[PDB]
Amino acid sequence: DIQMTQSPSSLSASVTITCRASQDIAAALNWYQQKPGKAPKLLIYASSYLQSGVPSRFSGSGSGTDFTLTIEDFATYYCQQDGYYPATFGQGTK
Amino acid sequence: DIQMTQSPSSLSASVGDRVTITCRASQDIAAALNWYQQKPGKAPKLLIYASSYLQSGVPSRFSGSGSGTDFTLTISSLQPEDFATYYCQQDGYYPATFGQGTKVEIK
Amino acid sequence: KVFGRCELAAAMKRHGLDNYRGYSLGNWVCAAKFESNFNTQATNRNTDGSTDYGILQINSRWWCNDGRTPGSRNLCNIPCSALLSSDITASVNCAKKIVSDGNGMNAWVAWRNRCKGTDVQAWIRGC
C-alpha cells in the first residue's frame, strides 16, 4: 500500500498542511475535509483542481511525493491518493 | 453527481450478532462502489473494493454484495474492534461521492 | 491483479491505445473500470452461453476461445484463459482487433452507455 503521511497531526489556529507519499504518485492526490460525525467531502482533485462550490482560499499544490493544502474550516483534512490500487488516505490533520 | 444514501445512521448490537448496512445510489453505478472503515482517531481505510472484493487483512466476517443501485455490507459476527463508522463511496463517476456513514457500536 | 487508475492508463498508453482510432486514452480506462473494475481476472458468464474475460471483458463466442462456448469464432486467435494475465498485452492486442474504426468502442456496452460523450479525460487526470 502507498502510505500517505500527513504533517502535522494536529494544529491549533485562529481565524499549510503537508501530505507525503511513500511512493511517487505523480499528481494523483486528492484533499478531503471532514467535520465531526459527517462524511468526508472532496475539496481538491488531482493536486490542484478545486471542486465546484469550494472557495478560492483553498488551494492545492505539488507533484511526485510531496503535496500541500493551503488555508468554519476547523475540521480534519485528509489527503487521498486514487492513482494506485488500493486507494489510501493519510492519517489526517486536526 | 451521484447521491449515495446509506442506512442505518447508527447501530448497536452484541458480540457475534449479524449486522447489515445498506447503500443506495441515485442511479446505476454497476459495481463501482467501495466500503470504507473509519475507526476512531483514524483515517478511512478501504475494506471492500468494487462491491465485493475484500482487501487483504480484512477478516472474512465482512462481505459485500450488489450491482446497480443497491448495495450491502454485512458483518456476519460483530466484534468489538468493528467499532467504527462505515462509509460507502461510488467511484465510477466524477466526482467520487460518499454515503453519510453508519456508526457501529458493540454492547 | 487489480490495477490502479494511473497504473492502467500508463500501461495502456505504452500499448498504444492513446488515440487508437481517434479514441483518447480516458475512454479505454473508463471502459475497463465499469467492465472489470480494473481486475485482470474478472470473468462473467452470460445467459447467452458466452463468457467475458479479463480487464476488457473479451467474449468467448466472438473473440477468444474458452472451449465451453458453442459457435466459437475466436477472431483474436487466443484462448480466453490467456486474457487473465497481470500483463494486459493479450487484452490490448485483442481490443485493437475488435475496434477497427471510429465506432469500434461501441463493442463495449458499458462504454457506450456510461463513458461515450462524457469527460473521459477525467480518468487520467493527475497521472
Domain ranges of chain B: 1-107
Catalytic residue (choose from C7, C48, C52, C66): C52
- Between the alpha carbon of residue B15 and those of residues A64, B12, B20, B107, the distances in Å are 44, 10, 14, 7
Distance (Å, whole) CA C66 – CA C79: 6
Judge whether B34 and B52 are in contact, CB under 8 Å.
Answer: no
A71 is written with which cell numbers? 488555508
Chains in contact with B via at least 3 Cβ–Cβ pairs below 8 Å: A, C
Say which residues have a Cβ less than 8 Å from residue C20's Cβ, sequence separation at least 6: C28, C96, C99
CA dihedral sign, ordered C54, C60, C63, C65: positive
3-class DSSP state for residue A78? strand
CATH placement of domain C1-127: 1.10.530.10
Is C35 among the catalytic positions?
yes
| Nearest residue to A33 via CA among A13, A53, A12 | A53
> CA C18, C21, C24: angle at the middle one, nearest 5?
35
B56 lies within 8 A of chain C by CB: no
Q: With beta carbons under 8 A apart, name residues in chain B contacting A88.
A: 45-46
Instruction: Tell me the technique behind this structure.
Output: X-ray
Is A78–B43 a contact, with Cβ atoms under 8 angstroms apart? yes
What's the rounded Cα separation, in Å, for the pair B51 and B63?
Answer: 9
Any chain A CB within 8 A of the CB of C7? Answer: yes
Catalytic residue flag (residue C18): no
Q: Position A58: which residue type?
A: F
For the CA atoms of chain C, what is the radius of gyration?
14
Partner B, chain C 106-125, Cβ-Cβ below 8 Å? 110, 114, 119, 122
| CATH code reported for the domain at A1-94 | 2.60.40.10
SS3 C127: coil
Distance, CA of A30 to CA of A81 (rounded, Å): 6
DSSP-derived letter for residue C114 is I
Class of domain B1-107: mainly beta
C6 touches chain A (CB under 8 A): yes
Handedness of CA A79, A81, A82, A86 (dihedral sign): negative
The phi, psi pair for C120, rounded to 5°, reads -65, -30
Percent helix, strand and coil across chain C, each to the nearest 5: 40, 10, 50
| List C7, C18, C35, C119, catalytic entry | C35
Q: Where are the domains of chain C?
A: 1-127
